[PDB]
Amino acid sequence: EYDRGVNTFSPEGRLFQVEYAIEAIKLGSTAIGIQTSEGVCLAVEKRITSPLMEPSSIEKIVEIDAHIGCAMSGLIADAKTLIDKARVETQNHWFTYNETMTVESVTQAVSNLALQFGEEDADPGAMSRPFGVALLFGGVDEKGPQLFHMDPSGTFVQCDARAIGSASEGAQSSLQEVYHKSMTLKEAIKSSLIILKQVMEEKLNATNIELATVQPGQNFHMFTKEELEEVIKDI
Amino acid sequence: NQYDNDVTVWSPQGRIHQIEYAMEAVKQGSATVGLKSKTHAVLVALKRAQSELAAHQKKILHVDNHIGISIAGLTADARLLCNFMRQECLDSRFVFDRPLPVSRLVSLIGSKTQIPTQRYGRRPYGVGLLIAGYDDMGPHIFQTCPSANYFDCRAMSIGARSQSARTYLERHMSEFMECNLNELVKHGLRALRETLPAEQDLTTKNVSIGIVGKDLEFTIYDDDDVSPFLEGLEERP
Amino acid sequence: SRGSSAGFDRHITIFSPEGRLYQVEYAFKAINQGGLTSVAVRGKDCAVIVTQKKVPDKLLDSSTVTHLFKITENIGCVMTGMTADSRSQVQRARYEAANWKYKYGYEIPVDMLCKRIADISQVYTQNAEMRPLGCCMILIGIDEEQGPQVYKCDPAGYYCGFKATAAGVKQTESTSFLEKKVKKKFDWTFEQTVETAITCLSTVLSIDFKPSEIEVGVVTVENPKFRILTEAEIDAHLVALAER
Amino acid sequence: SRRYDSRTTIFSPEGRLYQVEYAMEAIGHAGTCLGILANDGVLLAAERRNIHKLLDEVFFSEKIYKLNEDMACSVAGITSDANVLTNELRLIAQRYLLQYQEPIPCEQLVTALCDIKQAYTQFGGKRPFGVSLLYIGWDKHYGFQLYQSDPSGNYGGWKATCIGNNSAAAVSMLKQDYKEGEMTLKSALALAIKVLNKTMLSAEKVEIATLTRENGKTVIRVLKQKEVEQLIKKHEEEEAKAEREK
Amino acid sequence: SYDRAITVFSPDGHLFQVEYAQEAVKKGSTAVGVRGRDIVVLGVEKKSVAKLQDERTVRKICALDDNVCMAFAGLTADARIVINRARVECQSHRLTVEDPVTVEYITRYIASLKQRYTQSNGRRPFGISALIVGFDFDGTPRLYQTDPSGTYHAWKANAIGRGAKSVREFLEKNYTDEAIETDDLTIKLVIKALLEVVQSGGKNIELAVMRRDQSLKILNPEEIEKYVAEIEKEKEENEKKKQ
Amino acid sequence: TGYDLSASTFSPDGRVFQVEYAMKAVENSSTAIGIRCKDGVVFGVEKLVLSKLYEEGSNKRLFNVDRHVGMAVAGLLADARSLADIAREEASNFRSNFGYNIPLKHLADRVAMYVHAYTLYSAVRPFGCSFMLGSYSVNDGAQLYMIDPSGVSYGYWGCAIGKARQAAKTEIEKLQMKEMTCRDIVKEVAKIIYIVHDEVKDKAFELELSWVGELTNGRHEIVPKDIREEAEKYAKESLKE
Amino acid sequence: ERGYSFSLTTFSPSGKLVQIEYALAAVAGGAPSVGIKAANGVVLATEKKQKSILYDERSVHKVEPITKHIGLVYSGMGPDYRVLVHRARKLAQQYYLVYQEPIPTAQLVQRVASVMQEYTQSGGVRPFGVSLLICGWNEGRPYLFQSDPSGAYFAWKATAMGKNYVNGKTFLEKRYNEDLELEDAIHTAILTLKESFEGQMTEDNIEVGICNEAGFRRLTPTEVKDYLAAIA
Amino acid sequence: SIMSYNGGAVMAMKGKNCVAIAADRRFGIQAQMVTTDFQKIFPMGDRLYIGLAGLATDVQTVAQRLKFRLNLYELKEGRQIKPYTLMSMVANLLYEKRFGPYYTEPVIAGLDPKTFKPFICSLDLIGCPMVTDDFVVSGTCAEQMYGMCESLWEPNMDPDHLFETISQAMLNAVDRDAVSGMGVIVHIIEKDKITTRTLKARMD
Structure with a gap:
């Protein structure tokens, strides 16, 4: 309703719009990121809605830069502006400093947009509402592999393993049950796919999920259907 | 009700409910304590972890060689204010080639955060700050609020359950001036521990420290760098 | 209908079903909140404004408490209603008169100044985002052609010249008294005009004024400069009134 | 201020734009306008509502506006809104002529105006224009053309159409009386007179404009009282014969 | 200017304005798209055929460039705005990249425009959904769908507008490798899908086809009637087979 | 009843309720008093100390707005600091x-x-502070003005703002300030502040003193510490007896 | 503050712009005004009753010249009328500056009506609460126009506005005649005012202006006195 | 010099109940001829014409913008423009570019739409108007045209005599100017008809 401005605090000290946007996150398809010493693995349920749809057109994991990928959950159309800002940020950083932006810096630059919405004293081009999407930025910088979570409130945090989206509760509990700091990238990929298979409704197969990894050696890499098939076979 | 949705609406009692709600935003945050001696200013922040696998949210930030801050409340507003403060200090060093005195920075913060509390469609900043600084007048602890009021404190604590920390600080403030750095940090840590529940305890993961002084630029200690300060701490009652 | 209302017509300046602007009427009511009354009378070769002076606190600096203002050396005014609204309007009138002289090379006539202020007020009555000012302005001055001039503008943007007028709580009774006085005759001398204004105020308030309870400002064809009388002159007038 | 804002350009829970629907409701009560396309011309016929005996006539017509050498329109709805839109139409036509040095094709003019209307329905917080327009024109791409546009910014081309009061009954009559591809200006005028007679006639109560081509030039002409009186009398005697035959 | 926030979150995390725009889309006439091997077919329900209307002026199928065309369902005027923006963008892409747009590129542009209108002050969302079909320069046929929220997907076959649910269920049961082996069968699949919803016959149907390397081709009513007659022959013969 | 939500709305009685509510905010503040004497102006403030954690001198309610002009405030402190910045800008621009x-x-x-200007619009709200301006000059003498949230400005011989303004005014009216010096007036100001202070409700308070007059050569400044100590001793002695 | 950007005049479910109807109610509650177009001129007359004798009746005029050849009068709200008079004079001068010719009456009426329309759609304003009668003389011809709060304008031979204007229009229908001269038109206009007038009419109770070849001019109290003596 | 870039000459002349307007036909760039049929006289009404000399681009731009403004004026007013009003409109248009002026000096010739009274006038490039009772000229060969017209013009000429006078003036004037000529076009405007003629002229 319009009884309140978008910048109205609740009596409990929270912005109404941000809390509603978080509620919106809780309707997205489930994504899971796991950070290990050998790299970061991102996975996301595609949620095919019709067999006439082309699963390849569902892009839930995108490349921010050769060393940074992002998984997203919630209102995916809202994520496009944030993804473009992150990409432009990394390329501006490379242009100015002749070096690669750290995952934390990219996450910070994106999170600085979360609360930049409002109505009065706002020029055209101003956002009228918060973004209804949560992001998992996985990457590899001088500090090794890094996994970061950002939500609509602009708060971002480094995580060892994080689940976002509709089933994030059970997914997070399982991740806590299975994660150890010494696990290998293969172990993390297998565990993430097991958790996704568990929390998903449709049977997990090579077409209805997305899986990417970032490693110190290789750049951001999206698993092909055959690699996905090989990983799924051992589950 | 009809008085508790906009910052430009006075209630019949002479209050502005939106500002009080932003105060609540601050009161929800995790506790942080600031205190000082004749030579040092210390911030000790209890950091929260949203999940057992997530890193604890950073609560202490750099502003300038002589100024650091601890934040409690909305972290995006905290980042906005920190960026503004950093730019102010940079402007001072650029124009006058001298560090910005802490009190003047606090006054600028006050003006900046008061402006939106009077304009339709704007909201108060939802963050409280503890500001530790050192300048020609010595060390300083300041507390800034969403109401745009600021206070110059011998010691302060803000955030959830910070009343216990304030009780400890009121009890022990007589000793802070003649404390060495280690005793000062230990007092800060005991005050912060008073905010903790019985089950929780101070560790090297959920504690961060910030120290500034005459010959010490503002330094943030995290993780194992906190172990030296925690080592001498006794067991809580 | 009668006093009917639709939508937000009681909160902002939009027409009610009867074609009324309730906020303007409420500004007129706000004029009376001050509790004071002023009267203006036009003589043959003079114009006079008298007004109540109230200083309930002896700690107030009585010199600073006044409702008479110089707009120009030859134009004076008495303001009635909300004090801060009145001061803003006086500032605007002074600006308008100075700008007029700067742009056209002669002093603004009283009628033209009143028209300009009234036009500003009218704007307040058609744009919804601001309220009308809760004050009424009475201007006096000598026009080289028309002679003495008394003009009044109100929060509705309506203005008019007058032979005599009043503003404030006792406006209606003041107007009745002055109507009788002007009906009997109108060709007053300076002393006669001052005494008529004072008698109007005293009768409507039922008080017999000490010099310090009222303020008097005058323009005359002999001395067109706006002049505020001193307690000595006011007491002379009050004694010359009591004796008769 | 949020409290007083009408929120003109928002959807309703059923996917409707209430201000646009209300503007169309306003048009429904305005004076009847009808357009008929023929092989050798196109006509507009409008019911005059300014029928008071003390009104003076000073203008080219009451409801028909020339837009450019080759195009005219009639308006049903809010009169002052219609004046705004006719001025904008004339400006658009002249801008096109300045840029290209040819007259604007009719559909391009209609589309340019409908873009303005649609804009008023999507942003800015203003009430929409409460006007529907009938356009008649000629261009070299499609010949004689008749268009209709409404407050939503929707528009369409027609062989015959009606807006304003009793438009539904007039449309039914046209559906049952219009001979596609077999209409002349004369039979079109007869049909217009019949339809206006049903959805209501006398000469002073209707204005009729015709648009034709003469020697590679477009002629827009408002029929004088003599011609309209003759048309009404011809319809009256036609109806008398039809009644007598039965 | 006017800078109210129109699209805002509601307590359950829903954007009511986007949902109401989607209701408006569901009020539109049904549009169907099928992606063939060498042909992409768009059909639209020409609802309420008025004998007096000039059909050329109310076509819901349009060309964006030589290789991309679009059908839509919802508010016609909003669709006109979006189509004009997309045409300008296609020409800009030709100017700056010196090649034609991919179907995905202009689809992304339109979806981004819509998303922008769901998150900017003083604007309501576009009340249209679009099917964008075309051929990439390398020859691949493409069918995409966009909705008011600014999300878009690629489809093998799809429907939008009123009765899109039933049409989509029919296309699920009928889209096969055999059913799109030839241009005739692709066109007949589109016609059958529309006939499952349209009130009566091929009178109420507008059909356009795009073949590889060729421009948009509108099927005239005679061709549509011949195809409908073939469909009725097939239906009768197969029902006789069943009996 | 809907009429009291915006400063651009008159009530049916011709009142602007948002301004009255701002004035209430002023009324719920600790008192400040200004006194004009023959030689200058003295300001006293009862700064309530809401915790011992605060450094002495925190949240000062006396400001220097110009070399020759001091300002004492009551109400929302942040609004008061904003108005002090405005006053400083006005003085600096006038000098320029x-x-x-x-x-x-x-x-x-x-x-x-x-x-x-902040009492006319829905876009902004009225200021929630009242304040006094004091000055002394050779040419103009001693001047004391008070401004309230409605924008009404008046000159005074003695002024009290805050929650105990009426009792403070009753006490001020007992002084013949027109024939007194700043040196005695500082003691009287301290005494009045101590009298009107509520020892039970308000807990502890600091006395803030400032002045501007001949003895300061027209410069507004805090009262020297020894002078304030003497004044506070006198005020406490007056209270105890 | 900056003004509200949204329109305060919007459509009702019945299709009415109710704020315009309410502004028209304000107009209908105004003081009566009359216009009559004669063969050789136009007369505008209006009741000018003051609340009390204290009012300097000759300080504010209701009949205003826009140009040498154009004058106008109103029914409704005076301050709104002053706004429109200022706008009309500005518009006429702009036309003169571009075309070096006195603005035709119809063109002036169209421009003023355009302004009035703008105030029915722009953000944060109400419509003008006045109706105008505009009289002019050009091309050797007199013109009488009425312009309403909605921005719609009509050409009249004779009309009445304000309180009791329906009876005035019936009276004008009965009395009016296209062939009558200007003096007969003045007599008829004053008679129309008399129908809805309270108390005795004096040269100070009503205001009259006339437009003819020479130009538009407000009649003097002495001329109105002569016409009133003749009317009796 | 900027207005000699393309050359050209127009002239208008007043008869008894008629006007004449004539122009040379050459479009060239400095010394090079490009075409010999460039239009410099534009209809603005049934009996109202404007001739434009000077820079060819500005000739075309001014004619087009004037037609824009005139079309809007005649739609809004519902009447043909009078010659004096057209002169004022052109003056306003040119003065709007007071510091960026169009490089053309128009002449106007017409009859009153209601009285059919002859009108001619000329304007400088920033729009100063000059109404005359005999003749006006504009272009590179202004001095030559002035000589011819001052010598040949007589009051109250009938259309045939006006034609001969303006024709001889134009032909002999342009014969002494290098960058004007290549033909002459003449329009005689009368109450009942417009007669357009092209003259036998030197083509060097």
């Missing part, structure tokens, strides 16, 4: 344009009009 110290009456009028 006209080349001399702004007269106190003119400064008060300018700041009062700035305050008034």
Whole structure:
């Protein structure tokens, strides 16, 4: 309703719009990121809605830069502006400093947009509402592999393993049950796919999920259907 | 009700409910304590972890060689204010080639955060700050609020359950001036521990420290760098 | 209908079903909140404004408490209603008169100044985002052609010249008294005009004024400069009134 | 201020734009306008509502506006809104002529105006224009053309159409009386007179404009009282014969 | 200017304005798209055929460039705005990249425009959904769908507008490798899908086809009637087979 | 009843309730008093100390708005600091344009009009502070003005703002300040502040003293520490007896 | 503050712009005004009753010249009328500056009506609460126009506005005649005012202006006195 | 010099109940001829014409913008423009570019739409108007045209005599100017008809 401005605090000290946007996150398809010493693995349920749809057109994991990928959950159309800002940020950083932006810096630059919405004293081009999407930025910088979570409130945090989206509760509990700091990238990929298979409704197969990894050696890499098939076979 | 949705609406009692709600935003945050001696200013922040696998949210930030801050409340507003403060200090060093005195920075913060509390469609900043600084007048602890009021404190604590920390600080403030750095940090840590529940305890993961002084630029200690300060701490009652 | 209302017509300046602007009427009511009354009378070769002076606190600096203002050396005014609204309007009138002289090379006539202020007020009555000012302005001055001039503008943007007028709580009774006085005759001398204004105020308030309870400002064809009388002159007038 | 804002350009829970629907409701009560396309011309016929005996006539017509050498329109709805839109139409036509040095094709003019209307329905917080327009024109791409546009910014081309009061009954009559591809200006005028007679006639109560081509030039002409009186009398005697035959 | 926030979150995390725009889309006439091997077919329900209307002026199928065309369902005027923006963008892409747009590129542009209108002050969302079909320069046929929220997907076959649910269920049961082996069968699949919803016959149907390397081709009513007659022959013969 | 939500809305009685509510905010604040004497102006403030954690001198309610002009405030402190910045800008701009110290009456009028501008619109809310301006000059004498949230400005011989303004005014009216010096007036101000202070409800308080007069050569400044100690001793002795 | 950007005049479910109807109610509650177009001129007359004798009746005029050849009068709200008079004079001068010719009456009426329309759609304003009668003389011809709060304008031979204007229009229908001269038109206009007038009419109770070849001019109290003596 | 870039000459002349307007036909760039049929006289009404000399681009731009403004004026007013009003409109248009002026000096010739009274006038490039009772000229060969017209013009000429006078003036004037000529076009405007003629002229 319009009884309140978008910048109205609740009596409990929270912005109404941000809390509603978080509620919106809780309707997205489930994504899971796991950070290990050998790299970061991102996975996301595609949620095919019709067999006439082309699963390849569902892009839930995108490349921010050769060393940074992002998984997203919630209102995916809202994520496009944030993804473009992150990409432009990394390329501006490379242009100015002749070096690669750290995952934390990219996450910070994106999170600085979360609360930049409002109505009065706002020029055209101003956002009228918060973004209804949560992001998992996985990457590899001088500090090794890094996994970061950002939500609509602009708060971002480094995580060892994080689940976002509709089933994030059970997914997070399982991740806590299975994660150890010494696990290998293969172990993390297998565990993430097991958790996704568990929390998903449709049977997990090579077409209805997305899986990417970032490693110190290789750049951001999206698993092909055959690699996905090989990983799924051992589950 | 009809008085508790906009910052430009006075209630019949002479209050502005939106500002009080932003105060609540601050009161929800995790506790942080600031205190000082004749030579040092210390911030000790209890950091929260949203999940057992997530890193604890950073609560202490750099502003300038002589100024650091601890934040409690909305972290995006905290980042906005920190960026503004950093730019102010940079402007001072650029124009006058001298560090910005802490009190003047606090006054600028006050003006900046008061402006939106009077304009339709704007909201108060939802963050409280503890500001530790050192300048020609010595060390300083300041507390800034969403109401745009600021206070110059011998010691302060803000955030959830910070009343216990304030009780400890009121009890022990007589000793802070003649404390060495280690005793000062230990007092800060005991005050912060008073905010903790019985089950929780101070560790090297959920504690961060910030120290500034005459010959010490503002330094943030995290993780194992906190172990030296925690080592001498006794067991809580 | 009668006093009917639709939508937000009681909160902002939009027409009610009867074609009324309730906020303007409420500004007129706000004029009376001050509790004071002023009267203006036009003589043959003079114009006079008298007004109540109230200083309930002896700690107030009585010199600073006044409702008479110089707009120009030859134009004076008495303001009635909300004090801060009145001061803003006086500032605007002074600006308008100075700008007029700067742009056209002669002093603004009283009628033209009143028209300009009234036009500003009218704007307040058609744009919804601001309220009308809760004050009424009475201007006096000598026009080289028309002679003495008394003009009044109100929060509705309506203005008019007058032979005599009043503003404030006792406006209606003041107007009745002055109507009788002007009906009997109108060709007053300076002393006669001052005494008529004072008698109007005293009768409507039922008080017999000490010099310090009222303020008097005058323009005359002999001395067109706006002049505020001193307690000595006011007491002379009050004694010359009591004796008769 | 949020409290007083009408929120003109928002959807309703059923996917409707209430201000646009209300503007169309306003048009429904305005004076009847009808357009008929023929092989050798196109006509507009409008019911005059300014029928008071003390009104003076000073203008080219009451409801028909020339837009450019080759195009005219009639308006049903809010009169002052219609004046705004006719001025904008004339400006658009002249801008096109300045840029290209040819007259604007009719559909391009209609589309340019409908873009303005649609804009008023999507942003800015203003009430929409409460006007529907009938356009008649000629261009070299499609010949004689008749268009209709409404407050939503929707528009369409027609062989015959009606807006304003009793438009539904007039449309039914046209559906049952219009001979596609077999209409002349004369039979079109007869049909217009019949339809206006049903959805209501006398000469002073209707204005009729015709648009034709003469020697590679477009002629827009408002029929004088003599011609309209003759048309009404011809319809009256036609109806008398039809009644007598039965 | 006017800078109210129109699209805002509601307590359950829903954007009511986007949902109401989607209701408006569901009020539109049904549009169907099928992606063939060498042909992409768009059909639209020409609802309420008025004998007096000039059909050329109310076509819901349009060309964006030589290789991309679009059908839509919802508010016609909003669709006109979006189509004009997309045409300008296609020409800009030709100017700056010196090649034609991919179907995905202009689809992304339109979806981004819509998303922008769901998150900017003083604007309501576009009340249209679009099917964008075309051929990439390398020859691949493409069918995409966009909705008011600014999300878009690629489809093998799809429907939008009123009765899109039933049409989509029919296309699920009928889209096969055999059913799109030839241009005739692709066109007949589109016609059958529309006939499952349209009130009566091929009178109420507008059909356009795009073949590889060729421009948009509108099927005239005679061709549509011949195809409908073939469909009725097939239906009768197969029902006789069943009996 | 809907009429009291915006400063651009008159109630049916011709009142602007948002301004009255701002004035209530002023009324719920600790008191400050200004006293004009023959030689200058003295300001006293009862700064409530809400915790011992605060450094002495925190949240000062006396400001220097110009070399020759001091300002004492009551109400929302942040609003008061904003108005002090406005007053400082006005004084500095006046010196820049006209080349001399702004007269106190003119400064008060300018700041009062700035305050008034916030009482007319729904876009902004009225200021929640009242304040006094004090000055002393050779040419103008001693001047004391008070401005309230409605923008009304008046000159005074003695003024009290805050929650105990009426009792403080009753006490001030007992002084013949017109024939007194600043040296005695500081003691009287301390005594009045101590009298009106509520020892039970308000807990502890600091006395803030400032003055501007002949003895300061027209410069507004905090009262020297020894003078304040003497004044507070006198006030406590007056209270105890 | 900056003004509200949204329109305060919007459509009702019945299709009415109710704020325009309410502004028209304000107009209908105004003081009566009359216009009559004669063969050789136009007369505008209006009741000018003051609340009390204290009012300097000759300080504010209701009949205003826009140009040498154009005058106008109103029914409704006076301050709104002053706004429109100022706008009309500005518009006429702009036309003169571009075309070096006195603005035709119809063109002036169209421009003023355009302004009035703008105030029915722009953000944060109400419509003008006045109706105008505009009289002019050009091309050797007199013109009488009425312009309403909605921005719609009509050409009249004779009309009445304000309180009791329906009876005035019936009276004008009965009395009016296209062939009558200007003096007969003045007599008829004053008679129309008399129908809805309270108390005795004096040269100070009503205001009259006339437009003819020479130009538009407000009649003097002495001329109105002569016409009133003749009317009796 | 900027207005000699393309050359050209127009002239208008007043008869008894008629006007004449004539122009040379050459479009060239400095010394090079490009075409010999460039239009410099534009209809603005049934009996109202404007001739434009000077820079060819500005000739075309001014004619087009004037037609824009005139079309809007005649739609809004519902009447043909009078010659004096057209002169004022052109003056306003040119003065709007007071510091960026169009490089053309128009002449106007017409009859009153209601009275059919002859009108001619000329304007400088920033729009100063000059109404005359005999003749006006504009272009590179202004001095030559002035000589011819001052010598040949007589009051109250009938259309045939006006034609001969303006024709001889134009032909002999342009014969002494290098960058004007290549033909002459003449329009005689009368109450009942417009007669357009092209003259036998030197083509060097």
